[model samples]
Target chain A: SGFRKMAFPSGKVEGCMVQVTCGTTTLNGLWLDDVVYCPRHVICTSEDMLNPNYEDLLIRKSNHNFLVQAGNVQLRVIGHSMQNCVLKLKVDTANPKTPKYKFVRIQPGQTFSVLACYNGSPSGVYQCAMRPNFTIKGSFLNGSCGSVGFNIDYDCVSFCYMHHMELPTGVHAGTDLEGNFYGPFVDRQTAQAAGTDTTITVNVLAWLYAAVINGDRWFLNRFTTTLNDFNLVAMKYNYEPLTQDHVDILGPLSAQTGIAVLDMCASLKELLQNGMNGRTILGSALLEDEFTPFDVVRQCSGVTF
Target chain B: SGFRKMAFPSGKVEGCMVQVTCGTTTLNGLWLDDVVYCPRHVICTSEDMLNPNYEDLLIRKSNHNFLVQAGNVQLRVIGHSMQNCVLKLKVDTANPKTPKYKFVRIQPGQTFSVLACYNGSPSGVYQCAMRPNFTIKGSFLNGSCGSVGFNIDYDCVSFCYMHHMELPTGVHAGTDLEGNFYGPFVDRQTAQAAGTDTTITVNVLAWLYAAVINGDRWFLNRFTTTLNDFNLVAMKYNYEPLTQDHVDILGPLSAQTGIAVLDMCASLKELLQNGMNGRTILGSALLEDEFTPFDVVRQCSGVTF
Candidate 1:
């Protein structure tokens, strides 16, 4: 997606590369071939960006020179007297409805490790966390009960919203948009300025597993249609119309900027449709789909959840 | 709880009893209410239901029948924890941005993790808040970020109460329907027809307080006046009459339920209004919106509902 074209006052420009360093001012309505090589809230990072100041949460994948990729998240446990003690963990990602949980019993004098993931790549747990709560009968220490230590690791989740279908079991990913699209391709989900609303559902809904209903079709992110509107508002207001196609997408956008929920919903319906599809398959399987890992499979093994 | 009776499709007049230890079947529209003589959904005994399910939910007293009871939403930490170390907890209800937080200095060798809700009852669906019920806490695991996992407890209709508020700070309570009522009661509501034209005053202004000077005043009074139009729909045609006796609790109901984005919007307005002021007043809470209860009251000291 080397998609390029930048805008200017008075008119539209192509392959525009902008570099500005000045006092605090937002670099407004910029489009590709355009680059904001400096921070708006802090020092104009000629270099100091190894760490950005406050407000540097760049959620957009393509914003900086990065494209989101398929990945995995792994959480490890570090404890002294935790051996022989069962370490229970509740994993949290973007969606609360589907959380991944784990309980690994540690052997004496050993550090334990467990892996938590969403289906894969663009649809995995966007952000991750794990919490520790109890200590029943301890083994390493003469039947003693004590506090244990645990920490989180961020990577990709293996599934999405299947946990909400009342399936009750499966390594369901806390995601709900993109899950099963075989092939190692660039996920727009990983690259767009979308929310943690990634992960897909089973099409054969309600049934714990898959009727598949239809082969995995995208329910949302018709970014093919939607990604078009992304910078439409900016172009219009900035008086920088690059192409007629650019303005055509802006018609339904007679309203102002921001992610149009109206469009989002249009996409959301299909999103939920397909999400539920992944869900039905996973649920039917859950005997659970962004989903219960096929490893969740009393049958398939996509990832080792 | 003036519980109502369901109208029957009469053919013959007789109490038909049906029961089975277990399995499943298509029990028609009656769907096994006859089982509640025992319990398809409600218990029989004709007497046990001396307080029916709907009635059973009205566990609060009749001060408007609605109690803003100090309820609890216990988010349990799922593993061995916590020392006298004061762990800060960010309790997430409906909104993730403003989490209710608590810093409890747990004692060493203690089995903590009982995040008490306003409180809970076996047969209650509390209105504490529409939280995803996801909570995340960061603690010094052995003195660092060693906390993981999320344990969610579903507290249905189990609402408790807490009384607190103000004129400017008053998060006033008004009825929009038959729900319960508590504090600062200038409650406005309608049956199929009830509602109130409430008022909100930004009597005073400050940077963090009010951009509400003469400039914003025009909008405020109109806003205050429009807030009056709130009950505009409890009309005769609409049959929405606005008031009732007995604690007048318009408590929690599922499916065919109603929620006035009223309170949410009211506070949400101030939340936003005030957030912008913080940015304008002090300049730059630009990143955050809404005041944290732990800090909202203090920072906006005189802020009332």
Candidate 2:
């Protein structure tokens, strides 16, 4: 994957060593044959140079970066989040020139500790390689926008759920038996306390839940559309991240008024066509999706009042 | 108050024997010396003709009718309501003419059984009173517009409270211990059940209550202004219409959260200039004002949780 017949902007040719370091592991034998580096991170440092390209170097694979056959380059970007904050990531390499820049939506639960690029890098590269200095445009899920960082290392961008009612119910970094960082995940209630809007959250949720239970298609569509617009999912696995205790309480309480045991996930999914408003397979035999983990599924399940 | 030297637009004159009948009472010794009827509804049919005016003929007097001065005539109007639904009463005399008419805000709880008018019919008469035909315009408290009637002797107009949350808590016809109909009154919960918005009502009210307790003036002003714009009052008497039970429940529940015992009346009053956004006096004991009577004043009073 190393550069071939690469030359510098000055039209000069030179060989430079390339070392790719990801987290705890470091591979030093990798090198760039010429001073030229493709703006697209497709040029891998693998000595074989045939496969296992730059995108393959990360945990998540790459089918979404610039090409090499036509010449030139682009960089792969890894997006992550501590909370369900980072809505999208913008990779701006422009020296404050044109309005164009690289963009990728960071799925809510993608934790940053994994160092894996989100959906790999969306295809496209700068016409020419200039200074890589640019801004990290990060937007919060609460419809607020702000710069999350300047570069390489920045503060842990924190954002709270506008209606996430339960504790430990946000995004977190994933791991395996070997303690190796694999992917960012969700429905992650680490016995941690969260926040609430304390104003209209509960009320609005109750209204929405009522509509959902009645199987109101328009309301369901609107709800699903709104959540999708915010890049959020209804279920982490096959069910919402609600506890048995929460479910038990919800049943009778909701029944006292009317009924419950509503599978909003399935209900919302059926309202969609296919492969949309729903979940796909997870990263490790474990499925991961961003979801609201309410301390109690206030209107799900049925119980005696 | 009988019209003197009154003549019709046809420039014709004739003596029309006048007998004023109010409720079940009848007076035979009454006569109109002129065929002319004033849109102002003055011009009593009294034999003496000068003491008991046309408005004085009804139980409630009319100081808000057109004048009998300038040797012309006018009529008086009585505005009534079964509930706090009527925002402003518009008298559209436009057999579909230019957009101009009389208007009056029927205070909530002004019962119709009483043969009295609200605020004595805001003064202004149609110039030259042609057929005296007009449309009765009524608007609900929920920012919705709809007509209540076409003319006098219309059907019973019924309206509900947007947040009036208690039984026997809307407008009702006022009657004395002797069963004398006097004025339209409120805080008259008729042991009747009410409705709920089922969406954002409790939520919005709680938020508003919290802001009120915190004495957030801007929030208070906004709340008061919104209610005033809707022609609703926070308090029907020295205190809100909340009962001891409601007050008891409210104090503790509110305290459990933060605090309450908000005299939205006094609080809202202090935030406004003289005679604005606050109540004047009622009609019966006699201070009647439209108000919300939630079964529970969710947040008010000071009780232990």
Candidate 3:
């Protein structure tokens, strides 16, 4: 191609005009009109086409030289399911000029993920990218192109998706020393030896008599060891009387044992009325039979009557 | 006379013993009690019984030893005039024994006077022990006595019987420059030449116009030297008015020509109002010239014409 017409020099322009030959020099009769092609593309794609689902493009790894890795990536990309998703991870590349790796703009089901350790060695090739989106359940998992690429002697470990390790046992059977063994008692002789349900053995003897009269030793040892490990019988029937569900389970244990049984029946009626007035004055023989009259009626019944 | 049976000795007697030998001692045996006969007669007719009056007991050398000079003392001893009146002079006494002469209990006619004299002591005497019974009302022509007994001098001066050295001068006539003369201005030709009871020359032209409108040049030189020393009659006229005794003789000559005629009528009314309006602006000029503009046009023309 031989065509030249360049001449717009304003202040300081000096050397380097590469041969400056105008006309008569033919490499192949070339005609060029404003031919300008500055192609420097490193648009790594996690399929977030233009800018929607988890949009992120920030490129400039020094205009391309790539390497990117993201780990422990807990991606909950559900624009509609995992509670509406929008998750993304970006890394533009071009051999290792590493620059683009944007994070933090997550709200679309707002669950995010990222753990990184990227290093595209001595400038040149390793790419990893992700952009996930789903509002009404669609992309269970899609867009993640280079999956993880590296050339100059490989290295990559991109991850996301890890869950199961649940063994914590029934109703999360956790606490012990007579504490967290929750309820669901049954066994009326194992529900009539497996015939099943007699109202779950009357709600495990009404929750083990309301956890043993409410001194709830850890719910009364989880309701008497779940009704003796399910042999449940304690039936004393008559259910109605104070039932707003049994006064919501024995109204604070009947107001704390009815004030401790009315202060123990008023101290046994003041010690039997001072032991019948000190046994009528110590069995009245006019008093001292060594005063045993029941020890002078228990010291004049100072209240253990 | 002696019929010597003299055994007169009483208890407790000390010295003198007997010495009796009367001529013939026999008047009924010397116990004689009466033989009284004393008769002696001399030459008769001694000219009016020795001039009996003798000015009443003749104690007069100016009444014995009186010389009361120092600041003039006034005499007092009257009645028998001065019974046993022994006064002497030469005093200047009051030396530390300063009782300044007192002995005053005079009672019967109670005399003994002379009162004032602030210690210019020349002579002082005051003896008058008479007791005939109240008569004298003399001394105190301005007190002084202090000294009594020795000679018979008498010089008590200090007198004053109500003599105010005749005052009555200025209430009329002319003389203005201060030569101080005054009235006698009895008009009717000197009240018929000082005779006709000159009722002070019928008020001598109202005190010569109150000594020229009270600018009393010393009451117009004591009213023209007392009407030319009493030749009288110059009763011109014009005075009175300014009373308060003519402003107490024209209040200091009208306060020195009324403070130069009020500072020449406030500099001729501030040169005919080139400024200063409102009572010619003195003192709090109507509350500090009520914010000026000629006192806001004389308080908005309440007639400053």
Candidate 4:
């Protein structure tokens, strides 16, 4: 394949590069050598039998988009995963080795299957990156009997965005009770309603915090129901098989407030049900932002967020 | 000194006994041998050369009172301190060693003085135990001029009881904004007023918890002032001499809330003044009931309650 530079605004650093790779007829895509910038554009030539070229490959500033346009190519940048722009692909069942670039839509809460050879035997296997607020759950075992392979069930999931707060302008920016990150409000009244909803969400969390602390059964049950409700709501945003610090003051209670996720909500559900241990996780989250307090989650004997 | 057995319900344990001690004309109270219980009453014989006894020492099952009655014995069980009943004492300035058993009344917010000999020199010194809700502050130095001895100033204190909850019956048990443990309300309407006060106190603390976590200057300032107000109210309850858990859900934040006192309000005073480290102590207190999270207090660089 011909080599070309891809221009980056700040020029280029030692380890940064625009990576491109393509597969041989037999093997899946093999990593190609790193090429430097080309004026914010990516160019690949058809003359290079292995890698194709496109003129319309435009890069972006933030939330960058990697676009590739070529003859008869229906591939579109579906979303970003990790650092790469994720493009839709169609699996070749016979060989199950190389995937053809094509637009294959997967909605949240929907599931899809594909086959791949593992250890020289056809196996139910697949891989995918989680999209924002969405995850893909993989199941290797499905209906059996195909020597070709087992089917890999990829179920898309949407984890709950548990916090909602009113923006300064009074519009809400967090998830609804159902854990849906609402789009912009329709009107002023709608925004006001959202503000109220934000309060309810915030209060539920705050009340849940107190309930966990005080060991109040009624509030605990309320928290559990509320959280389950949110989780049920999140169930909507998942695709069938896909994927995806503050100073404490006041002492230990202060620290609890500061203690700082959920699996598909199973671990958290267990945490809420578990009581004391649940407070450890929940209070920490209230005090903090990101999850994955790995050691603590392990202490609860549950999954990490 | 005449000694007689006192009757106890459990008979008498090998180690448990009613201890009595009295001083000679020269030395202050000296340790005396233990005597078994006498019914639920304590009787001391007047004929004893050194140790005096009384027949009116009534005993209590819980919050036990050690009462003593004798000729012109104005001393009553002013309060309980350590493991003994704290009786009123009047220090003799001439000798400055033996304190006469007299009813020396001291009110909260009142200061008093006494003298004692330390290393053969008359010195201002006093010691007192903390009352359930009260404490005493001592000072070795006072206005000079007297060749007899220095005056020790004992200031009583009432530490703030920070948490408040409505009893199922709805009568309030905690303190008010002034940190005063209010007596029973005059009427049902008054009790309702107390409930509102209780809510304000709880919310202030909850808000303070958040303010501390968030580093919100406004809320932080409010917390500082609120705590200070409580402390100031506590200052009124000080007497002259002497005075005196949860499952963390969430994560590290959970741990923070469990962190569990005031030094007559000084350490806490500093805690509200400090910030992050303060949360370690304050948060711990909220999650747990007791205040002596000693190690954490040291972290805040404040006094242990």
Candidate 5:
């Protein structure tokens, strides 16, 4: 309704007013005018509303990796679709549209291709995901493992499948399992065992982050449980959510820690859960963590972060 | 505080007990124990910590591709430092305290290596980040991207780096600059004309997810800015934050549309940014988009959702 010349600190630009809007029929649950910042903050009948094509029960390629020719990427697939099976084929979303498609067919092992490119058709990744029988899966054209841009004829193709439950029987913790873990010993096994306010330990704000950034539904589940547990304990622990300087605390914590959807979920989880705890853990975590968000990207993609 | 067996939902998990904590001198903003379940929710701070490593600086390597020797993968790096510069090497945190080091240092470019083994250190992505002078820079090891596990020497190496503000002069936006774009519509300039409560349109939730999972500081900045906007508007929009429904919502969303640390960050940015405006252009753009998150991710890393 009202517009403010909010000199927002988003490094996005010098500064812009956030023309925060309300009640609109768009999917942007919240959005700002050009001033700052969309919908479905509500009304999403399902998260599936957000599910992209390749997400369906996927049928892996004969080979995991796709190959690129010149600037084109090609993948071999078994004909598992009906005719007109709308395979949402995307080349370089960051780029503009172009001549229909380069290739697509429900052949014996149809070799479908898309002219994959980025800036001048740079050798980049491309995908042709389907939304059918929904075993639906999407694959990388050009390459895999954050690896793309091989303009060769038969470069191997692959896709990353990061799971929540297990980061693969192969994935491991960042720290030594035998050593102290990166978590709220207090949250679960806090100091109900000891006396007055106990020391929080080497509690590198990072510990939580360590678990958090790599966490999944189960991780969240524990966080939810932990937050409530804290509240009840706060009752016993003789503390309250950081209200007075909550924003001051949260603001900086937010500024320093840097969260995501859950970060919002995280921040609010803090807001909803408590204050100091969330801010401190989140803030310090980022501060103390060696990886930083940059490393998280590399790690998730395939680095030993 | 006491613990409760809350059948609480967490968009990620179902019923579980949240073991909250308090009265400690440190900060563990959030947590969940392993009674109901673990993993997917637990373990690993290195991923979290490593994030910051390059956030301040950055940068990567060549080989375009690397091979995993059995599982012990390797990457080449010029001897930046020595003994003290110990590449904070880490192995599958899953194993117990072993002999001496999971991490190692280099002399010469001896390819000073690390024996990366996921399950059995079944080849996963690893990096050789530097210290001091800092930003220092890091390289890939073990395996590259999400594809790990090779049984050879100096097999090969790789990593993916996608951008928006400006992809590498060497990097292309999956295609070319002449094409269209993946947006901040306004941030980059949209239709330039619009209305009020103008339906935010389900802006490509994927677009955000795409940028998010692939986001960096700039990306998180946008999402943070985006989340607050959501709250600001949710007040006027007559919607409450997703509660029981939140988990119900997040659960399926998590299930259907997967995410990365940035994905969560991605989700909220959309949350904070007001609607009717941001989505207007973004949504129509996608509806007219030609490219989608599926496409975006395709170009970013290898992901299913």
Candidate 6:
């Protein structure tokens, strides 16, 4: 009798995880004792033993039970015959109630294709147990069985709660922390500074600053709405209000700024509604700058006053 | 231009519904106007004017706006050189607050598939509209666009309700309309001879029979549930003698029988939950049966004394 044990993130394994062992006289066969651990451990074994090749072993892994979220998984088998085999598969999530797992069996000399999708959600561990089946005619007088185990970690990260902050002024500052304000602002500034003319660079830099600030404000607005707060804390502690001439030069700068902010907020809201979770929100410029007055507002009114 | 109008259901051809003059001889395509007085219309164009050796023309007629029950549907556009055509799909429930419509592009000589699922509770017309790109090489040049309208009717038909009744005597007369008593003794044979079986049959027959009496009971259950009553008429009638045997047999029997009824009701409930509408329950077996005096005693005193 052969035995093996392996742990998985969600008690499941995908791809190839098998082992095979033979003495001075090569063994002929293998068998599997399959066990699946979910909320509880469910163990299953083949009605009978299997045959494996002396040099080439055929391996396959079982699937996680229905209660387990089906996706890319891992497996660990022990005993022997592990080195000679590989497993390939695709798990279907179309019917969540009863997800079906389809396997693609491959032999030693045969080429196989695997299309496995990884489930990055940070949750339970999934694993499958399998054994190799082959026949050997060499030094071994009769056939014998071996086993091995392999595993894959399924990291499930769920985006559920919105990362938001309320300022002393009762303003909620909630925005998607992922590639929202930072990416676009940097890209716009970089492109603007790369322009041919000095005047254009200056103008671009000014616009980029406004764009960044406006994005921050919009993010704050959405954060406020999403968190159901009204007043948001302003971040820029050291900043000169645009002169009328500067506003004139930018031409509809306020409107453009407002539109940009709204657009960013819309995108953030969409991402939030689509089941995104686990993100960190960086505080506004004023809070980051350690402006005491702004912190005071936040502490007093629970809003970014 | 050679325009013709073909009315389906009654193969009537009305020439020149839209005048087609000789100015555009290079015109080589077919356009479909909206279907009149019908939810859908099928059109088949000849293979001569439209090249290729295919014998049948299969085009579905549907409205860009309509209502439907929740399920899967297949829409096909049977035309030659239809590649690179843009198809626009829009779904509107009776409630304007929810609208579903998206644009999809189709490859030439290929088919476009649209899968629409509605899980809304109320019933409404679901519409599917297709707009193909203008083709220059087809039979009809200076090709004008046409609209096809299709409708989906969702009807609710399963329901449930709870009520009370009375069984007259422990030895009640089981008879047909001629007043022939079924039995004065117990057991199936004696009762069958004396018509006791029929009485038992009639006692539970009203509801049970109703389940099979009309194929429409399922629909009736749904229609009634949507009403203020919030009831699902029983699919099978049950009786308890107010004795230990009744408790043992009828308890589990009633519970088990109720499962089938409830299952049917639930299937209808799911259909209704998915937003189908405009159906009504005609009547029920419980309402149609004659109450036994024993039922009155059970309802009045909690025991069939």
DockQ category of candidate 4:
incorrect
Model 1 per-residue lDDT at A97: 21
Runs in model 4 lying further than 4 Å from the true structure: A1-215, A219-305, B1-181, B185-194, B198-305
Worst 10-residue stretch by lDDT in candidate 4 chain A?
A1-10
Query: Any runs in candidate 2 off by more than 4 Å, and if so which?
Result: A1-209, A212-217, A222-263, A266-305, B1-210, B215-299, B303-305
lDDT of 5: 0.21
Per-residue lDDT for A1-305 in model 3, tens only?
Answer: 00001111100000000010112110100001111011011232324323322213332222112221212111121111111121112222121222222212221121211111111101001111111121111101111111111111011111221111111110100111111111221101122111111122222222223222323222111111222312222222211111134234433433544422222222222322232231221111111111111111122221110
Candidate 6 C-alpha lDDT tens digits along A81-120: 1111212112232222221222222221111111111121
Q: Quick one: how many clashes does candidate 3 have?
A: 54
Pitting candidate 4 against candidate 5, the one with the higher lDDT is 4
Candidate 6 is graded, for docking, as incorrect
lDDT by residue for model 5 over B23-68, one digit each (tens)?
Answer: 1111111111211111110111234322223322112311221111
Evaluated on chain A only, model 3 obtains a TM-score of: 0.11
**DockQ, 0 to 1 scale, candidate 2:** 0.01
Q: Least lDDT summed over 10 consecutive residues: which range in candidate 5 chain B?
A: B1-10
B-chain TM-scores per prediction: 0.18, 0.19, 0.14, 0.20, 0.18, 0.14
TM-score for candidate 5, please give it: 0.20
Give the best candidate by DockQ.
5
How well is each residue in B1-305 modelled by candidate 2, as lDDT tens digits? Answer: 00001110100000111122232222111112221111111223335233333334434533333222111222232331121211111121211211121222233222111111111110000001100011111111110111011011111112111111112322122212111222222222224333321111222233334434333334233222333332234342222233344445345435644534344433434432232222221101111121122211311321100
The DockQ scores of all candidates, in the order shown, are 0.01, 0.01, 0.00, 0.01, 0.02, 0.01
- Candidate 6 chain A, run of 10 with poorest lDDT: A135-144
Which 10 residues in a row give candidate 4 chain B its minimum summed lDDT?
A: B1-10
Question: 1 or 2, which is superior by lDDT?
Answer: 2
Model 3 chain B TM at 0.14
User: What DockQ would candidate 4 receive versus the native complex?
Assistant: 0.01
Interface RMSD of 1: 30.5
TM-score for each model: 0.20, 0.18, 0.11, 0.18, 0.20, 0.16
Select the stronger candidate by lDDT from 5 and 6.
5
Per-residue lDDT of model 3, residues B97-143, tens digit only = 12111122322211121211112221111111111211111111111
